[PDB]
Amino acid sequence: LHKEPATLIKAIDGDTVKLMYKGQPMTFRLLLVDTPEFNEKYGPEASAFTKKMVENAKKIEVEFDKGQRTDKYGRGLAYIYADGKMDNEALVRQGLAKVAYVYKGNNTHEQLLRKAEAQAKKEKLNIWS
Numbered sequence: 145l146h147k148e149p150a151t152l153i154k155a156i157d158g159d160t161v162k163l164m165y166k167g168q169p170m171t172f173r174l175l176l177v178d179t180p181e182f183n184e185k186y187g188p189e190a191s192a193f194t195k196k197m198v199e200n201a202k203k204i205e206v207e208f209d210k211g212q213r214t215d216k217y218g219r220g221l222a223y224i225y226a227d228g229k230m231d232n233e234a235l236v237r238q239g240l241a242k243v244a245y246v247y248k249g250n251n252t253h254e255q256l257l258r259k260a261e262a263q264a265k266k267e268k269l270n271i272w273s
């Protein structure tokens with residue numbers, strides 16, 4: 145996989161963000177995770193966590209996987225990095241997302257994220273409390 149440039153347009157919630165990618169605005173949905181909706185328990189914390197990561201980043205990058213690059217809603221499907229740190233993994237490691245929506249052929253980082261979930265779960269963090 146390859147990292148490509150993007151710039152923040154605006155945070156949306158724990159697992160979606162609006163970025164400018166190849167000069168076009170698009171909403172990105174984070175691969176392989178599910179944060180609670182803003183209206184649910186840990187939803188505000190998930191939203192906050194992603195907002196902070198992307199707004200503080202000097203460099204945002206998007207990494208597509210091998211499979212579909214947009215979903216049925218026209219959202220980009222990617223791993224999103226803030227100064228080299230992957231938000232997808234970070235939200236899971238913090239107990240602010242569950243590994244979810246693991247579809248064949250867009251699952252390159254599946255093991256890495258499950259390992260993070262196992263550790264968040266061992267620590268009883270947030271969702272796992």
Ligand SMILES: Cc1cn([C@H]2C[C@H](OP(=O)(O)O)[C@@H](COP(=O)(O)O)O2)c(=O)[nH]c1=O
Binds near residue numbers: 174177221250
């Ligand atoms: C993360 C992801 C979501 N989706 C679709 C599946 C779900 O369809 P449904 O809306 O029919 O439930 C939806 C969940 O996204 P959200 O968790 O943002 O609601 O997004 C994909 O198709 N591929 C993906 O990789």
Ligand SMILES: [Ca+2]
Binds near residue numbers: 159178180181
């Ligand atoms: Ca969600």
